[PDB]
């Protein structure tokens, strides 16, 4: 049974996030919500306070088969600030671990800090423009190896959808969840 | 500028309520959620603890011009079992504000308690052959007067920008608020 870390800090664009988390426990994938934070607490973009399974400097040893990493603009800028997620990005990283930012986060995160390593990549806006090693391709969803990003939040769902597949490694429940709440997979 | 509740009970469809809260937000339409009884914390279906704006016993004079009512196999439950919920969705319902109910709600709170006033409306899955006196349609999102309901996770996109639209008596704004999350609406 597989487990994914769903990294929120101050102001991740929590739409991105619940989404995402809402697909994969419904197909009863372990996630956890890591606090990048002091405290559990901590409130997204649009002002909703939640309370995290965990904070990252808790779960700094784990070995999580997905990492999710939200956008929002103060969020990801948030993430790319802070010396733990970079370093369990990379660790996750290299040990092939499935990476999978979503909106800015994949321009913020990994491409301001030079982490995309030429993999194609789509992320929002034209973000991209000052992202110098990485091959931005507009599309829902881009896969390289084991970088999966999601362009924005209207494709959340086949960002969703497509991380639980991989992660699964068969579509039959995946596209049974998607029956269930209507959207065609 | 248009007031938004949204109703939070144990157990709320967190998928449903956030993404529809986000929407209204960008749009800069005001939102409170309320948590339904003693608590401002709430746990949604999927796990996840939200901290409420307020509660419905703070805003019992409070008229909002739009009410959400999220679904929630036990959301839903806790919804139709509560009197202040049913109370404050009667006086909105009365005074023509909109009520908006998504996925099992609209079988679950309003029909439960033969308050859909034999309106045309959509829930999830095959609730409504229990619903008495609706009109259950089959489509994304079926508006008729002032009740705007959403027939599952899938169509919430459709349904937020639906109600916006409504709220905002103007498609320009939400279209534009659409494409610049890359949702084709
Ligand atoms: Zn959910
Ligand atoms: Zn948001």
Same mark, same amino acid.
């Given at each position: 049974?597989?487990?994914?870390?769903?990294?929120?800090?101050?102001?991740?664009?929590?739409?991105e996030?619940?989404v995402? &988390?809402?697909?994969?426990?419904?197909?009863?994938?372990?996630?956890?919500?890591?606090?990048?934070?002091?405290? !559990?607490?901590?409130?997204?973009?649009? #002002?909703?306070?939640?309370?995290? #399974?965990?904070?990252?400097?808790?779960?700094?040893?784990? %070995?999580? #088969?997905?990492?999710? &990493? *939200?956008?929002?603009?103060?969020?990801?800028? $948030?993430?790319?600030?802070? *010396?733990?997620?970079?370093?369990?990005?990379? +660790? =996750?990283?290299?040990?092939?671990? &499935?990476?999978?930012?979503?909106?800015?986060?994949?321009? !913020?995160? %990994?491409?301001? =800090?030079?982490?995309?390593?030429?993999?194609?990549?789509?992320?929002?806006? #034209?973000?991209?423009?000052?992202?110098?090693?990485?091959?931005?391709?507009?599309?829902?969803?881009?896969?390289?190896? $084991? %970088?999966?990003?999601?362009?924005?939040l209207?494709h959340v769902f086949?960002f969703a959808?497509?991380?639980?597949? +991989?992660?699964?490694?068969?579509?039959?429940?995946? +596209?049974?969840?998607?029956? =269930?709440?209507?959207? *065609?997979?």
């Amino acid at each position: 049974m597989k487990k994914v870390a769903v990294l929120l800090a101050p102001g991740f664009e929590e739409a991105e996030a619940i989404v995402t &988390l809402d697909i994969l426990r419904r197909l009863h994938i372990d996630v956890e919500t890591l606090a990048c934070a002091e405290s !559990r607490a901590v409130v997204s973009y649009h #002002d909703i306070p939640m309370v995290a #399974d965990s904070t990252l400097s808790e779960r700094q040893q784990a %070995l999580f #088969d997905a990492v999710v &990493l *939200p956008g929002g603009p103060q969020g990801s800028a $948030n993430l790319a600030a802070n *010396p733990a997620v970079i370093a369990f990005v990379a +660790r =996750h990283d290299a040990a092939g671990k &499935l990476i999978c930012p979503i909106a800015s986060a994949a321009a !913020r995160v %990994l491409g301001a =800090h030079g982490l995309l390593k030429g993999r194609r990549y789509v992320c929002s806006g #034209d973000l991209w423009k000052a992202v110098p090693e990485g091959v931005y391709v507009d599309a829902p969803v881009v896969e390289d190896g $084991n %970088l999966i990003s999601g362009k924005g939040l209207g494709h959340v769902f086949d960002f969703a959808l497509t991380l639980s597949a +991989r992660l699964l490694g068969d579509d039959a429940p995946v +596209r049974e969840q998607a029956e =269930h709440i209507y959207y *065609p997979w």
